[PDB]
Design an enzyme around this catalytic site. Structure first.
Site, PDB file in Angstrom:
ATOM      1  N   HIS A   1     -27.986  11.873  -4.325  1.00 17.45           N
ATOM      2  CA  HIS A   1     -29.338  12.447  -5.340  1.00 17.45           C
ATOM      3  C   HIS A   1     -29.661  11.573  -6.670  1.00 17.45           C
ATOM      4  CE1 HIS A   1     -33.612  14.021  -5.983  1.00 17.45           C
ATOM      5  NE2 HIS A   1     -33.771  14.469  -4.460  1.00 17.45           N
TER       6      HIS A   1
ATOM      7  N   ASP B   1      -1.342   8.759  -1.649  1.00 22.08           N
ATOM      8  CA  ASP B   1      -2.010  10.011  -2.538  1.00 22.08           C
ATOM      9  C   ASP B   1      -2.506  10.913  -2.021  1.00 22.08           C
ATOM     10  OD1 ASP B   1      -3.015  12.150  -4.410  1.00 22.08           O
ATOM     11  OD2 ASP B   1      -2.751  10.212  -5.503  1.00 22.08           O
TER      12      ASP B   1
ATOM     13  N   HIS C   1       0.609  -1.380  -0.002  1.00 17.24           N
ATOM     14  CA  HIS C   1      -0.171   0.075   0.083  1.00 17.24           C
ATOM     15  C   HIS C   1       0.666   1.637  -0.422  1.00 17.24           C
ATOM     16  CE1 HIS C   1      -3.402  -2.482   0.917  1.00 17.24           C
ATOM     17  NE2 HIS C   1      -2.924  -3.078   2.085  1.00 17.24           N
TER      18      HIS C   1
ATOM     19  N   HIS D   1      -4.493  14.470  -2.275  1.00 14.33           N
ATOM     20  CA  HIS D   1      -4.845  15.277  -3.250  1.00 14.33           C
ATOM     21  C   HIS D   1      -3.789  16.791  -2.820  1.00 14.33           C
ATOM     22  CE1 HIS D   1      -7.879  13.330  -5.598  1.00 14.33           C
ATOM     23  NE2 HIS D   1      -6.604  12.585  -5.521  1.00 14.33           N
TER      24      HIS D   1
ATOM     25  N   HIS E   1     -27.453  15.681  -0.976  1.00  9.18           N
ATOM     26  CA  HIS E   1     -29.034  16.426  -0.784  1.00  9.18           C
ATOM     27  C   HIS E   1     -28.838  16.159   0.646  1.00  9.18           C
ATOM     28  CE1 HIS E   1     -32.902  18.291  -1.926  1.00  9.18           C
ATOM     29  NE2 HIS E   1     -32.960  17.340  -1.041  1.00  9.18           N
TER      30      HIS E   1
HETATM   31 CU    CU Z   1      -3.821   0.174  -0.761  1.00 13.92          CU
HETATM   32 CU    CU Z   2     -35.105  15.075  -3.838  1.00 11.23          CU
HETATM   33 CU    CU Z   3      -6.260  10.491  -6.992  1.00 12.33          CU
END
Ligand code: CU
Ligand code: CU
Ligand code: CU
Ligand code: CU
Ligand code: CU
Ligand code: CU
Lengths: 332, 332, 332
Positions: free
Chosen positions: C299, C91, C88, C93, C248
């Site tokens: 939604h 990352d 593993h 962002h 929503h």
């Molecule tokens: Cu992983």
């Molecule tokens: Cu709705």
């Molecule tokens: Cu990514």
């Protein structure tokens, strides 16, 4: 009087490169002349050797990026050589009227046409073929590109200060719908007419078989990776004529992003990922801060890493350990 | 004290038309009274004659557009006649509390209810049926519409100047999930209860079989095409209660677009295509500049041209050759 | 000189809760130290008892929300215990360079690593595992979370006035792609390597089998419903590492929404539904005005009510009959 305006002929280049242009207009309004020749050709789109019958503007998927300034006139000569088999046309999302030009540009094989339109709105816009009754087939066979209409005084940030790019790339993202048999293998066809109903059936699943940048899996990798240097300001124009996409620069950001591509709007700042709707072009500006390999992907990671929607940037320069460092390298 | 406010009864009209209203409020806050009657009915949704059991507000898919001003009260009398078989209710995305009203409006056949809510936020909003345990079935059977809550001083552009429309249309886009047998033909059902598990199975594929405007393939074409004249300012309200859509006017633009429908935000300018998320209504303003036929589509072009998400505008007036012209008509 | 900065160790908490932090920075820039331990475990994700092999950061899906301020340094110690079977990494962002850290954090079982990066951009950002050649498998197995980088002076509205939340919740939405046999039943696997090609096949359909909040159908319901009081200002951070979502609040709104999560941009006002693109985190601020149960959903109502993308808020306090009332309760 359009006849009194300067004319300038543009020689287009293959994506992801973009023809030379000025960001800030160095002349008054002009008639900008482009020529594209339609090419129907076989294209190998993946590592397995899957070969489709592509429909292209100028031999490439996507078609080339055209670049003009707001209130220029775009004059396009579209050529459909007699070596092609199908009727084609062109629709510009930048244009006003006649279905974006599509109603005026229907060319049978062996025909050509010339369309002129005023580029009244600044932005990046999709263009695509759209023959009556066959529209999604042509578009999803590769027959789309984009046009950038720059503001006459170039791009601006959210505060109205200039944004000037050093480099520009055009990433066309293409969704292909290769017909499959019930076992799941791709079918192969003897004529366009014999492929058509199965193409329609494949499209109707709404599930692309391939989603690629610059026409094939891995097209923007290796010797064809995008390049930059630390400190360079890069504009990436990204289009998708049929399906939503969500670009992301892995290891970077969109410093200034026009996700729906229209430069009268202030850009979104500091984006990780942005949504470009199907039928739209978007543009992202980034200044590289670190060297190395970046991946530019559609951040549906299945679409990126299984279906092909991933390219690379190779960036040269100095590593900044203040921004990122390994404190303790992986160890037992 | 709400009893001291004026009451005004609205008589609704069938989409894509919209009941008469004032853009700028000519009165103070009012209680605006609406009545809708639920109708379960058979509807033919495509050219093949595919017939579904639709669930509707007021006999139409979509339900009618309701129009009020900010800080009006909306009072709805909802009638479920004893000729229907199912329990229904109504949820307004414009409302605050009780699941948008859904918790207070459960009506068995032969029952009616009246809900009042304060329209505190300006925008276009979805309304839909949402019975506990059956929500997506009702919504994807047609039981949705929209409500527009105008600012009391009408719409404004990105600089705060008035935007006044001459015409307004409401395009409801509906995703249907018609159950299919393993050969791919649509199945047909003797009772709602007998259809239910297969409806659920079809929905779970997440792939609509039909995506239509105003309730059927081609509903907004021919004698029912939308109309305008060159120079007319048109507002198109577009809703999708369940699935993202990306409207595009082929040959035009969204001059001012509220893609997520909320008028306190400045509109996006000069859009080619805009993304309206599932469960949202959006609104686009355009001033026509050219006559002729326009297509208004969802710009997933497969959804538009294969699954039904396309309508037409017919626009009258003078052609502007400065904006677009054929220089050389298609020829050998 | 980073060694001269204060260090602060954070103890993370399980979503949907968030570790304690200050909205407005009470210190100068700091090195904020986090530790996460990767756990591969079986997880029951639905009411039928469907059990998958989840890959998690810190034992949860999603991984915990990390919270820092702009221009803090994030220092993460990532531990891959020898009880796990796979390689593993992580990352971010939020980070700049080395594929968001992924290139520097590859840990085999029995290894650990420490990464430091400068949080230069304010917003909510996704983090996820991204091992070369296996990225979407890890992400769609649960190995993602988010990090919030607050502006040093806290959140601001569209006019630059402070927005202060009383409560914050983190809703991670996870798309699972559980392999199915041709009859449609979920398949079960003896080793990760034996599951892999079928996982890839399932992902390629682009159709999730489950879409859940906080790791399972109904995870945010009942005794684990989100809570608030009338008048409380609540920030809901929502991430989706792979697929678009459209949150929503049923009965409410997003008063201030950063749909793509980046706080240098003015928020969108009065949203009914907002689109968070795959690979993005978003944040919505709402002040509750009515008591009772609210449903917080994706939604696409099929994804919400059939595939699992729905949670509840339970809100205490006084009912406001001015905002909503039943005038005539359902009756014959
Ligand atoms: Cu992983
Ligand atoms: Cu709705
Ligand atoms: Cu990514
Ligand atoms: Cu063509
Ligand atoms: Cu188009
Ligand atoms: Cu109903």
């Amino acid at each position: 009087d359009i006849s009194t305006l300067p004319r300038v002929k543009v020689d287009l280049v293959k994506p992801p490169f973009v023809h030379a242009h000025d960001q800030v207009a160095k002349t008054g309004p002009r008639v900008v002349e482009f020529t594209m020749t339609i090419e129907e050709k076989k294209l190998v789109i993946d590592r397995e050797g899957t070969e489709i019958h592509a429909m292209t503007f100028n031999g490439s998927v996507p078609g080339p990026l055209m670049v003009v300034h707001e209130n220029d006139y775009v004059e396009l000569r579209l050529i459909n050589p007699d070596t092609n088999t199908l009727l084609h046309n062109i629709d510009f999302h930048a244009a006003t009227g006649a279905l974006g030009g599509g109603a005026l540009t229907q060319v049978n094989p062996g025909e050509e046409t010339t369309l002129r339109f005023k580029a009244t709105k600044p932005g990046v816009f999709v263009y695509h073929c759209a023959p009556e009754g066959m529209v999604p087939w042509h578009v999803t066979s590769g027959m789309n590109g984009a046009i950038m209409v720059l503001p006459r005084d170039g791009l601006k940030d959210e505060k109205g200060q200039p944004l000037t790019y050093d480099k520009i790339y055009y990433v066309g993202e293409q969704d292909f719908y290769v017909p499959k048999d019930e076992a799941g293998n791709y079918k192969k066809y003897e004529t366009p007419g014999e492929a058509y109903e199965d193409a329609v059936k494949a499209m109707r699943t709404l599930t692309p078989t391939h989603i690629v940048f610059n026409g094939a899996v891995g097209a923007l990798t290796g010797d064809h990776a995008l390049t930059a240097a630390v400190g360079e300001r890069v504009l990436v124009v990204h289009s998708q004529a049929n399906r939503d996409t969500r670009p992301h620069l892995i290891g970077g950001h969109g410093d200034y992003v026009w996700a729906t591509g229209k430069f009268r709007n202030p850009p979104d700042l500091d984006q990780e990922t942005w949504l470009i709707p199907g039928g739209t072009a978007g543009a992202a500006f980034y200044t590289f801060r670190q060297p190395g390999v970046y991946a530019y992907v559609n951040h549906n990671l299945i679409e990126a890493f299984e279906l092909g929607a991933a390219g690379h940037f190779k960036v040269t320069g100095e590593w900044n350990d203040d921004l990122m460092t390994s404190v303790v390298k992986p160890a037992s």
